[PDB]
DNA sequence: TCGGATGTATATATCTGACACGTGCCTGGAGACTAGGGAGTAATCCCCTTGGCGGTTAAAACGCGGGGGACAGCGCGTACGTGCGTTTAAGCGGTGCTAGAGCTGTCTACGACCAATTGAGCGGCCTCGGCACCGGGATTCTCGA
DNA sequence: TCGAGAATCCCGGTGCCGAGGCCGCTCAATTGGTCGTAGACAGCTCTAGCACCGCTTAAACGCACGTACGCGCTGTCCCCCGCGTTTTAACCGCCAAGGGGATTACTCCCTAGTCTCCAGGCACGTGTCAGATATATACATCCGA
């Protein structure tokens, strides 16, 4: 199979085929299915080592949305990259302004 | 129908192996995967059609992630993506 | 698996 | 139908204390009342504009997402 | 009695680590319904739209009240004002 | 041999403003928006065929990808004019 | 007639439009009504915009446009300054706009 | 001798009827070679890649000028200080 | 290549915040004014010269500065597009 | 054609 | 309460760089014909939405007393506008040069397309484990002296 | 600084609802070959981006003044806030009906493709024109007297 050449846990031929049906360009290239699948693995292994940190510092052993919101926001550059996305039933992060605090 | 459940599944235990994952969660992520797909292909198909080409390749799929990612995500992306490719060819 |  | 009205001052409460705020004006409500209105009228147009293009009656939470999307809103948790 | 501006801050605390849905499904229901009569009639809604309606209001309102929190506290007040949500949506884009 | 919308935009402005000229900047900034708009259009229109699993891009995309775009009297005007067309053209 | 553009009564090139939707990977195929109406739709627009950029040279005592022409006349008008309001016109210059309170 | 803001009313006026650029072109142009230097090193640049960044800078600046004013009277002030610009930044989002 | 953004002088921030319709400015807004210009001008740059770098250029073009403006959300007319 |  | 000095709009000249029209001709748009398949239409089923009922009980509405913060006024000191004389470098017009952008030739290495397999991945199903909630105690806050 | 009064976190019981793992099927991914063309590469051209110079001169700079305006403070008062009572309707099951989404199959007409001619549109060429300064003049318009 294409990922475990490769190397990965994404399906590099579902990526494959994600790309040429989705009427990006009139050709696929063999290696951007491996490149776009690596990279898709990358960030989800990042969104989910922060969010089992969160889950962990939570006291709980399953991720759920709130730690997931709690990773993203937590983390600035990944903030940064989903910057304009909500995230349903996860609040937000804790904050009060000091002025407002007695 | 088809998802990314499976292989968020295996990253997850690759990274946290006593951690489940709820479905709100796991759709999250699954929708998360796709609009980053979305748009990485999309960067890739608007350089190709800069440039007068009619294919997408790695080199388009790198400077896509470059233009879409903030600083250590984007130099550590490239890395991983370069890996992959130089193993598959090599295999 | 190179992460942050 | 006076359906507005049905946000209430307690709940405009909440969501300025999870905003961070910790005194409102009596004038807060009846101001955000309107925002809400513009707001979810924005987004209804565009749901029930793909739902037309559909050619169906049940507007869908593709609908509600795809619209959300079309603005710099993205949703996740319901197929985005 | 407690004094003013601790129930606040306890209600503050409270509300910016729960998760759940701050408006009442039912009313929230009916308004959406309302609301999209003129676009359309005889319109039905699945529960999924409905819920998808409300996480993004909430989301939305909660980011324009942190928003006209800060124009407040730029004014040197504490209380936000119809003045300060109208200034943090004009500098947002909005109106 | 670059195309560009300079002889349709000079030919609008003669039919609409009769004696009017028009000054290079000002024509590149016109093609620019005419560019604009028709990407947007077309990309709305793609992301609709998408949605729908449709293959070919119609008038019906079209028009829904105006309507969601343009604002309310602009999108009237433009679906009036649209629609005109294609009847014109499908009568001839 | 001959050209697809005079069916149509357009003057926007409807065999161009057509050549650029094929083209530009939007989708697999492409309906015969579409040029005509994307066509249609972008005349439209252009005559929308030139009216009001002649309106406003017309005002300053002006026979031709500019870039400040077609600022004036996007930003006057509620819905095109929507429709544009994400776009820096080059040699534009801004509304004149004073705010009360620094008026004497 | 004038008294002070009728030659800033009057400036405004000049400046809002205007439309040129009213940034220097040769420093501009060296403050953008110098901050190129750090991405790629011998980069040669269009007098028309030169004249869209001049062009978009200043837009952006006016921009950011008119909401930090707005911030400023939002504050019962009459005078812009870098907690205005601050604001509008943190309200725009950058 | 040094000491350039003080070629961005006051009297030119003066003129920017006129252009703005400012009527009093602060003595510390110039320095926070060439604070925001640098990142918005790194940020633009930055992009425009990947666009270069990808197309194998040692050429920076006003395509390349419009498509890393339009990238942002900047878009920009009359340089073409 | 018709403005508005 | 009148006079003044600075900026701004008005009259007219000019020499211009810019543009509005005519043209070779070549490349792209239009005709004519077909081949297939995308989509329309029809029909069915059963998911999932909508409408009603009865209770309970948590949230909403409402009044009340007060104290805390919004706001108006006032006085002060400082920092920013204004104007003038002196210092600097931007701008303009040339002049020279070679890097690099762009275009032609070529021809091969890579991706599309097709037939035939065979397994990874998608639904149904179970079974049981960690967190929502509650009963009870202790720590962290506030409110009052 | 030193008392009490509540709010809430932690420990333990627990139950239960849906996630983790386990199969049956199946379509989609893989493997092999063949083949047309995209794009890497090589070379000659010619534009344009860079660099040096010399002169104005317009903008940038520094400085002295003084005046408006941030800013702190004090007092008033009214308007949220916290709290206890009565009132409303949301929420929760649960039932009943059926509208319409989702699927399969049969047609058939609309679009891609291909071979031709054939002019619309670009680059080139070329002659006239609206106006930015330049010079001079009249009209507001607050500031000192």
């Given at each position: ?64 949305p ?37 | ?25 796991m ?65 | 698996?190179?992460?942050? | 139908?006076?359906?507005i009205?049905?946000?209430t ?7 300025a ?64 | ?8 801050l ?44 409300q ?36 500098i947002?884009?909005?109106?």
């Amino acid at each position: 199979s294409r990922s475990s050449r490769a190397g990965l846990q994404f399906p590099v031929g579902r990526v494959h085929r994600l790309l040429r049906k989705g009427n990006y360009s009139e050709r696929v290239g063999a290696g951007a299915p491996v490149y776009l699948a690596a990279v898709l693995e990358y960030l989800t292994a990042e969104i989910l080592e922060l969010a089992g940190n969160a889950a962990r510092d939570n006291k709980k052993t399953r991720i759920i949305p709130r730690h997931l919101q709690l990773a993203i926001r937590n983390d600035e550059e990944l903030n940064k990259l989903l910057g304009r996305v909500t995230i349903a039933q996860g609040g937000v992060l804790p904050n009060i302004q000091a002025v407002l605090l007695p | 129908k088809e998802s990314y459940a499976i292989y968020v599944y295996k990253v997850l235990k690759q990274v946290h192996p006593d951690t489940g994952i709820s479905s709100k969660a796991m759709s999250i992520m699954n929708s998360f995967v796709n609009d980053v797909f979305e748009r990485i292909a999309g960067e890739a198909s608007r350089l190709a059609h800069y440039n007068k080409r009619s294919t997408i390749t790695s080199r388009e799929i790198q400077t896509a992630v470059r233009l879409l990612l903030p600083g250590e995500l984007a130099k550590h992306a490239v890395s991983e993506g370069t890996k992959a490719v130089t193993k598959y060819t090599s295999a | 698996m190179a992460l942050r | 139908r006076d359906n507005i009205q049905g946000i209430t001052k307690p709940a405009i409460r909440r969501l300025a204390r999870r905003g961070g705020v910790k005194r409102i004006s009596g004038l807060i409500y009846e101001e955000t009342r309107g925002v809400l209105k513009v707001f979810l009228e924005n987004v209804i147009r565009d749901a029930v504009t793909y739902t037309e293009h559909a050619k169906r009656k049940t507007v869908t939470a593709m609908d509600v997402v795809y619209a959300l999307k079309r603005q710099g809103r993205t949703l996740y948790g319901f197929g985005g | 009695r407690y004094r003013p501006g601790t129930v606040a801050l306890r209600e503050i605390r409270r509300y910016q680590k729960s998760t759940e849905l701050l408006i009442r499904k039912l009313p929230f229901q009916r308004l959406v319904r309302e609301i999209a009569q003129d676009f359309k009639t005889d319109l039905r809604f699945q529960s999924s739209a409905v819920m998808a309606l409300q996480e993004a209001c909430e989301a939305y309102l909660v980011g324009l009240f942190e928003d006209t929190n800060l124009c407040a506290i730029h004014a040197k007040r504490v209380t936000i004002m119809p003045k300060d949500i109208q200034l943090a949506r004009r500098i947002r884009g909005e109106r």
